[PDB]
Amino acid sequence: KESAAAKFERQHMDSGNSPSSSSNYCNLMMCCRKMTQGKCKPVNTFVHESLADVKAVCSQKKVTCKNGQTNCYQSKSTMRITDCRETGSSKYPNCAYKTTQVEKHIIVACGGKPSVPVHFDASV
Amino acid sequence: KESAAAKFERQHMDSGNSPSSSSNYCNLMMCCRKMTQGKCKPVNTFVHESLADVKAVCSQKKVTCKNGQTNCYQSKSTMRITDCRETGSSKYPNCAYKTTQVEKHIIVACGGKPSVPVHFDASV
Numbered sequence: 001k002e003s004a005a006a007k008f009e010r011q012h013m014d015s016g017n018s019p020s021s022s023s024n025y026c027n028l029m030m031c032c033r034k035m036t037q038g039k040c041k042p043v044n045t046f047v048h049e050s051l052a053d054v055k056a057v058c059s060q061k062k063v064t065c066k067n068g069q070t071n072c073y074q075s076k077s078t079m080r081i082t083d084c085r086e087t088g089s090s091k092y093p094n095c096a097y098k099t100t101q102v103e104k105h106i107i108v109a110c111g112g113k114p115s116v117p118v119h120f121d122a123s124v
Numbered sequence: 125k126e127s128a129a130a131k132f133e134r135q136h137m138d139s140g141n142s143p144s145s146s147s148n149y150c151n152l153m154m155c156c157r158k159m160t161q162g163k164c165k166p167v168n169t170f171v172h173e174s175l176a177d178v179k180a181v182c183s184q185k186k187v188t189c190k191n192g193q194t195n196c197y198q199s200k201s202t203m204r205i206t207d208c209r210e211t212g213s214s215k216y217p218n219c220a221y222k223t224t225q226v227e228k229h230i231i232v233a234c235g236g237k238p239s240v241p242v243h244f245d246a247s248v
């Protein structure tokens with residue numbers, strides 16, 4: 001069971017960060033979205049366009065998947081995204097990320113009915 | 125089991141114009157630090173000072189806790205803190221917070237051996 005001391009640190013301590021930082025985004029979001037549990041996910045992209053716009057990519061340009069499947073689609077336009085990459089100093093359970101604001105085309109794998117994004121393949 | 129569609133949304137979607145804005149700090153932090161599971165915690169303070177300074181409060185000014193417990197202590201000096209409070213529009217599971225950076229004295233309950241902060245009581 002989590003100690004009261006540890007609970008206080010979790011709920012109330014942020015000694016290592018500035019709340020006015022723009023570059024702490026990946027650190028917080030990777031944590032929030034449960035990609036720092038068990039291991040640090042090394043690479044992850046967050047997309048800031050509307051869910052409708054991202055879903056629409058499944059009806060856009062068919063392209064090669066990095067994994068050779070035939071269900072990938074590239075956005076017709078660039079999208080506002082954030083690239084999160086694990087830093088060289090990052091070591092689980094202290095997962096540290098470089099945040100990069102980018103505007104690139106996204107490539108997603110689509111699946112299901114309706115066909116919706118199920119995997120983020122690449123930004124190009 | 126989490127659907128592939130939902131997994132993509134969790135991992136890759138953060139729709140909005142200013143995702144890295146300091147105004148979003150509480151939204152991100154409250155999520156990361158596990159205070160938005162089950163319900164939105166309505167009020168929470170993060171402290172940006174060294175843990176040494178926060179621990180030192182346990183040897184500072186004795187004050188009664190808001191709840192009538194008698195193990196609270198007020199910081200002798202102000203501390204840089206971030207006040208997180210639910211907005212009028214916040215509704216679980218979509219928790220939304222107003223982020224306010226302030227400098228205030230903190231009041232914490234101290235417990236255990238060694239006696240360390242175990243609860244955040246108030247800021248004044």
Ligand SMILES: Nc1ccn([C@H]2O[C@H](CO)[C@@H](OP(=O)(O)O)[C@@H]2O)c(=O)n1
Nearest residue numbers: 041043044045046083119120121122123
């Ligand atoms: N720009 C990129 C490139 C790859 N990735 C991917 O990095 C991981 C491996 O390729 C993928 O996660 P999962 O495969 O764990 O879902 C994720 O889709 C990403 O999120 N952004």
Ligand SMILES: Nc1ccn([C@H]2O[C@H](CO)[C@@H](OP(=O)(O)O)[C@@H]2O)c(=O)n1
Nearest residue numbers: 011167168169170207243244245246247
């Ligand atoms: N300024 C304030 C006032 C209260 N709080 C507190 O709001 C809650 C109840 O007062 C406390 O959480 P828990 O009691 O759930 O740990 C938390 O310490 C805070 O974090 N900041």
